[PDB]
Amino acid sequence: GLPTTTLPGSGQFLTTDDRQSPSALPNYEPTPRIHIPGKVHNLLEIIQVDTLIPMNNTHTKDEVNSYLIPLNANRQNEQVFGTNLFIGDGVFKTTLLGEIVQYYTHWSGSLRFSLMYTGPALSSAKLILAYTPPGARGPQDRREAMLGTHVVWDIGLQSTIVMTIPWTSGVQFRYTDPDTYTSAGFLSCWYQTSLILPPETTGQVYLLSFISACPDFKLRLMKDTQTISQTVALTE
């Protein structure tokens, strides 16, 4: 008989501990694995695939239309859309990125925001996208917007433009749940010159917008998502 002493914590059950256990089914042989395409190893692998952002959130019931950012022909100087960058809330929240970020407490890294244009091929347009780093207000006019991170996008044969929100930060991690100290800025978009439709054409054209994370990205300290809850256990 070897002398032992038990410490504080004996008998506790910590849902996060990782130890060995007896197998209830001694000697059982599991089914062989066969090959299946698509294996995922890290959630970091999947948040780099871009998905659509319901940017046009202004509706009243969920609709395919809140994915469409409208553009008006012949407007000059004006603003196309605006949003803050609380990736865990608001427009971002239902996107795959938003949806995964919510399983973690802290995030750090660059984001990739792209816009794909869908107007007739014989039209043309020049837009400016601007990222405003924390510390200033959402820009109120392009002059204000153009003094921060921006890209003049020229609509052409190449249909999409990929803007990166480079990680601009004092503190090396931010909260995924919106927090002030930890806030990330604003994203706005304005006409640089203006949309022009060809003859025989009319109305609004739309941009689709996507979001995905750069390879830069870090997420840490897992927790429970506000995105799902329940009141009684389900049954069959």
Binding site: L25, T31, N42, G82, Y104, R112, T160, M222, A233
Partner: protein, 273 residues
């Protein structure tokens, strides 16, 4: 590892930021393709986002309850909770369910922890000490009918005996019939015109059965069982869109009617911040 390299002014014919998303690719664009950057290192590995880590902590998967009381004159033990049962599965309580259904096929060993606590809602002199016996009843094996049937002999069926207030823990290998468990199944068990559709048809491994071994004392004792499940040795294939609407049933994808808009409406314009 560098998180960003140093990059300076650019005036090229080589534009990495113009792409065609119609192709289905997400081109790997970085901050340094469109602003001037400085070197910085990652200092991070992505350890805690590994799927083994993501699915590897215990989650509550089931809460049931049984009572110790005089079975004298009870015509239906099962019905008196003289020993309940659970048609095993992992998608009754939803926190863990949304996590698993981020994948289509999943393969893992399970580690179960079972916590049992007792309650004595009406006048008792004391708290008795009960031993629970929770045995695994696969498909094609007698289910117990009374709380003290021959079934409980469990001569060939793994069973664990632990005390109420304590915890029991053991681990079961991946018992799936195929190479992975389906998270989803767009099929039937056969080409029947009225057979059920979905995964309740593949997913079946019979039910787990609990009872108190103790005979009855003078008062009644409620024992409530909580089953926790931890995936170990995880393998996951084919990522899918996360669950947006609420769940209604074990094993079907169905969402409730007149549900509410899941996308938050802006308080303001598209232009609003």
């Amino acid at each position: 590892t560098v998180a960003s390299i140093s990059s300076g002014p650019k005036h090229t014919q080589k534009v990495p930021i113009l792409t065609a998303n119609e192709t289905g690719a997400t081109m790997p664009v970085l901050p340094s393709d469109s602003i001037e950057t400085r070197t910085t290192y990652m200092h991070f590995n992505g350890s805690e986002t590994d799927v083994e880590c993501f699915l590897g902590r215990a989650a509550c998967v089931h809460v049931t309850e049984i009572q110790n009381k005089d079975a004298t004159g009870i015509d239906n033990h099962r019905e008196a909770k003289l020993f309940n049962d659970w048609k095993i599965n992992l998608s009754s309580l939803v926190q863990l369910r949304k996590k698993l259904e981020l994948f289509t096929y999943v393969r893992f060993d399970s580690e179960y922890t079972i916590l049992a606590t007792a309650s004595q809602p009406d006048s008792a002199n004391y708290s008795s000490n009960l031993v629970v016996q929770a045995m695994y009843v696969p498909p094609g094996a007698p289910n117990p009918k009374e709380w003290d049937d021959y079934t409980w002999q469990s001569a060939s069926n793994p069973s664990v005996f632990f005390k109420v207030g304590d915890t029991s823990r053991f681990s079961v290998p991946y018992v799936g019939l195929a190479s992975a468990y389906n998270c989803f199944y767009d099929g039937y068990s056969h080409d029947d015109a009225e057979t059920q559709y979905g995964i309740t048809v593949l997913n079946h491994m019979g039910s787990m059965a609990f009872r108190i071994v103790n005979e009855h004392d003078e008062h009644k004792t409620l024992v409530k069982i909580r089953v926790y499940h931890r995936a170990k040795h995880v393998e996951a294939w084919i990522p899918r869109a996360p669950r947006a609407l609420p769940y209604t049933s074990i094993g079907r994808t169905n969402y409730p009617k007149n549900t509410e808009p899941v996308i938050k409406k802006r308080k303001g314009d598209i232009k609003s911040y």
